[PDB]
Every structure is written in C-alpha cells, then in structure tokens.
Swiss-Prot record, chain A:
Other remarks in the entry: Present with 6820 molecules/cell in log phase SD medium.
Annotated localization: Mitochondrion; Mitochondrion inner membrane
Protein role: Mitochondrial membrane ATP synthase (F(1)F(0) ATP synthase or Complex V) produces ATP from ADP in the presence of a proton gradient across the membrane which is generated by electron transport complexes of the respiratory chain. F-type ATPases consist of two structural domains, F(1) - containing the extramembraneous catalytic core, and F(0) - containing the membrane proton channel, linked together by a central stalk and a peripheral stalk. During catalysis, ATP synthesis in the catalytic domain of F(1) is coupled via a rotary mechanism of the central stalk subunits to proton translocation.
Assembly notes: F-type ATPases have 2 components, CF(1) - the catalytic core - and CF(0) - the membrane proton channel. In yeast, the dimeric form of ATP synthase consists of 17 polypeptides: alpha, beta, gamma, delta, epsilon, 4 (B), 5 (OSCP), 6 (A), 8, 9 (C), d, E (Tim11), f, g, h, i/j and k.
Organism: Saccharomyces cerevisiae (strain ATCC 204508 / S288c) (Baker's yeast)
Protein family membership: Belongs to the ATPase d subunit family.
Name of the protein in its database record: ATP synthase subunit d, mitochondrial
UniProtKB/Swiss-Prot annotation, chain B:
Name assigned to this protein: ATP synthase subunit H, mitochondrial
Keywords: ATP synthesis, CF(0), Hydrogen ion transport, Ion transport, Membrane, Mitochondrion, Mitochondrion inner membrane, Transit peptide, Transport
Note: Present with 6140 molecules/cell in log phase SD medium.
Gene responsible for this protein: ATP14
Residues included from the entire protein: 36 to 124 of 124
The UniProt record lists the keyword Mitochondrion: yes
Record GO cellular component, one term: mitochondrion
Localization (cell): Mitochondrion; Mitochondrion inner membrane
Biological process, per Gene Ontology: cristae formation; mitochondrial proton-transporting ATP synthase complex assembly; proton motive force-driven ATP synthesis; proton transmembrane transport
Origin species: Saccharomyces cerevisiae (strain ATCC 204508 / S288c)
Intrachain S-S bonds: none
Length: 57, 89
C-alpha cells in the first residue's frame, strides 16, 4: 500500500505464491550413509573385541 | 480575496491539465505524456535489471548428490589409509 502505482506487486505476490513450494529437501542418502556406518560397526567391534580380550589377557 | 482566488484559479488552468487532468500541457513544447507513464514506467526497471530479477527468476536450487554412493572402493582404501595413519599416529 505504500505504492499507489502498484501494477506489479500482485504479480510479484503471486510470483512468490506460485513458487511458495520452492523445493523439497534431499534425503537421498539412505544406502551409502549407513555403508560408512557398516564399516564403522565392523572395525569398532573388531577393535573393541580385541582390546577387551587383550586388557584381561 | 481575489488576488489569491485568481492565482487559485491559475492553479486550475496551467497545472490543471498537467497532473490534475491529462490534457498534456500548453506552455511546454515537449509533451508530458510520453515521458513518465510509458518511457519512465519501465524507468524503475530501466534503473534495475529486467527479465532476471524483476521477473525474479524463481530458480530451482541446483541439486547436490552424495559421494556417488560408491563406498567399497573408498571405504576400504580409507581403511587401508587408516592403517597408514595409525602407524604414524
């Protein structure tokens, strides 16, 4: 309303509203992210099993 | 009194056609119409950029992917390199 010669704001306001759903998130990592973890379980438990055995040994 | 009324009347003759009405302008040789409402209506967007930021170009964000979802050829190499580091660690 500060502009008495508006003529574009409704177009611009609609332009914001038509692109109001800009873009979704990208949660694509659901197979490789845990593959880093599957190596993480493998090596950590390999280490933990060894150190637990060796500390008593 | 009249000397104010007549100049008040004068405000209803010379500038009445200027902005109060749209009868162009008598004293001026250049016209008043093809400057502000057609040439300078795009003037604000003749000062800024057109068809890129007035349209505003609502652009889809460029999508970035993960590490190509190829763990086997790097995780073991990282694991092999982890052996190299921990010897130096």
């Amino acid at each position: 309303s500060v502009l008495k010669n508006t003529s574009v704001i409704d177009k611009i306001e609609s332009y914001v509203k038509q692109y109001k759903p800009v873009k979704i998130d990208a949660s694509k990592q659901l197979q490789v992210i845990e593959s880093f973890e599957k190596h993480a379980m493998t090596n950590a438990k390999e280490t933990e099993s060894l150190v637990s055995k060796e500390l008593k040994d | 009194q009249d000397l104010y009324l007549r100049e008040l009347k004068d405000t209803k003759l010379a500038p009445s056609t200027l902005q109060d009405a749209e009868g162009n302008v008598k004293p001026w040789n250049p016209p008043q119409k093809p400057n502000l409402p057609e040439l300078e209506l795009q003037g604000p967007e003749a000062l800024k950029a057109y068809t890129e930021q007035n349209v505003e170009t609502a652009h889809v964000a460029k999508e970035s992917e993960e590490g190509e979802s190829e763990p086997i050829e790097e995780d073991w190499l990282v694991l092999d390199d982890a052996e190299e580091t921990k010897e130096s660690h």
